[PDB]
Amino acid sequence: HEFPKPEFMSKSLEELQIGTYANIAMVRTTTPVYVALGIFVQHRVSALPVVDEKGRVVDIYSKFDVINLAAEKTYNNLDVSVTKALQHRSHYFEGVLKCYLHETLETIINRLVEAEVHQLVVVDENDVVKGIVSLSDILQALV
Amino acid sequence: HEFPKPEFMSKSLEELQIGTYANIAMVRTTTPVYVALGIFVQHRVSALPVVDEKGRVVDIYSKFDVINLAAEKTYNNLDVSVTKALQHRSHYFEGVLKCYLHETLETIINRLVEAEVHQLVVVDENDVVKGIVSLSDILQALV
Numbered sequence: 542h543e544f545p546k547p548e549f550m551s552k553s554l555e556e557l558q559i560g561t562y563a564n565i566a567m568v569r570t571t572t573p574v575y576v577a578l579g580i581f582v583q584h585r586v587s588a589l590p591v592v593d594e595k596g597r598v599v600d601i602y603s604k605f606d607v608i609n610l611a612a613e614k615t616y617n618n619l620d621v622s623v624t625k626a627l628q629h630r631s632h633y634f635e636g637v638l639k640c641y642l643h644e645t646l647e648t649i650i651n652r653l654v655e656a657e658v659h660q661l662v663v664v665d666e667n668d669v670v671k672g673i674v675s676l677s678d679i680l681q682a683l684v
Numbered sequence: 685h686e687f688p689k690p691e692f693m694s695k696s697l698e699e700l701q702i703g704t705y706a707n708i709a710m711v712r713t714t715t716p717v718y719v720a721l722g723i724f725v726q727h728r729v730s731a732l733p734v735v736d737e738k739g740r741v742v743d744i745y746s747k748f749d750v751i752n753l754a755a756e757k758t759y760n761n762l763d764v765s766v767t768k769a770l771q772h773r774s775h776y777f778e779g780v781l782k783c784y785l786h787e788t789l790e791t792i793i794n795r796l797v798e799a800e801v802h803q804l805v806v807v808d809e810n811d812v813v814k815g816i817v818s819l820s821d822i823l824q825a826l827v
């Protein structure tokens with residue numbers, strides 16, 4: 542009653558049935574923050590895949606990103622793109638944005654902890670969104 | 685359609701009616717992580733005030749704390765106290781644990797952003813829990 546159980550750390554996301562793979566809320570690189578704020582408050586999801594003109598994931602926009610925008614001492618309005626969050630961090634280049642179904646729980650957990658991020662986008666071979674894995678999903682696997 | 689509106693940044697938490705002040709789920713410094721994990725998965729709250737023998741807040745235990753525990757390369761079981769999370773960070777000493785009803789939205793937002801934390805415990809004059817303010821609560825105020 543090692544924590545975490547080693548037999549479950551060696552299992553893939555697919556095997557453990559971890560994540561959300563239906564009804565994914567997401568936005569574009571051309572999406573203004575007002576759109577994302579409306580989603581967060583009315584639709585009630587914790588983070589949003591940000592996809593480019595090809596449908597490929599280039600960022601994740603979270604509730605903390607909005608608060609960080611709100612603390613900026615320079616003047617902003619809500620017509621700023623969600624891509625201005627990229628001035629504060631690059632999940633993409635740090636390799637802490639995406640994951641695959643075949644990756645192990647141990648791998649996914651290490652990636653989350655690596656940059657202190659609360660979610661990863663599950664993608665396909667073309668970096669197109671298949672689903673999302675958040676700490677809540679991991680916790681259900683850790684029990 | 686400065687974001688955030690200055691007239692709302694200068695208002696207190698009390699004035700804006702921001703936070704949860706009823707039915708707060710919390711744990712003790714003597715609480716094992718298995719207890720917190722059960723709360724997170726079954727009760728479905730995002731973070732837990734950690735209070736000492738006097739009922740004073742000494743930490744907040746979050747879902748990320750469990751994942752961080754799970755990534756530790758040393759051997760753990762679930763009978764570790766929630767206070768082992770304190771090896772990774774001290775919200776208390778950094779002044780990013782607590783807040784008051786009379787503090788401004790601007791103050792609260794800056795504190796969140798200061799340590800990249802997603803919540804603060806609202807306390808009284810004796811550091812006893814009155815409520816909790818999370819990014820979701822702030823977002824409802826930012827609209």
Ligand SMILES: Nc1ncnc2c1ncn2[C@@H]1O[C@H](COP(=O)(O)O)[C@@H](O)[C@H]1O
Pocket residue numbers: 560561563564565566567586587588589590673674675676677678
């Ligand atoms: N953008 C999203 N669209 C749909 N479901 C999501 C999204 N972001 C997170 N979820 C799911 O919401 C549930 C709760 O996650 P969390 O809000 O982090 O506790 C999890 O099962 C996530 O996979």
Ligand SMILES: Nc1ncnc2c1ncn2[C@@H]1O[C@H](COP(=O)(O)O)[C@@H](O)[C@H]1O
Pocket residue numbers: 703704706707708709710729730731732733816817818819820821
């Ligand atoms: N330990 C807790 N007990 C009760 N409510 C909480 C607790 N932690 C967070 N909340 C509330 O849960 C709601 C959603 O917060 P969050 O899960 O961060 O999106 C907010 O109104 C928080 O104040």
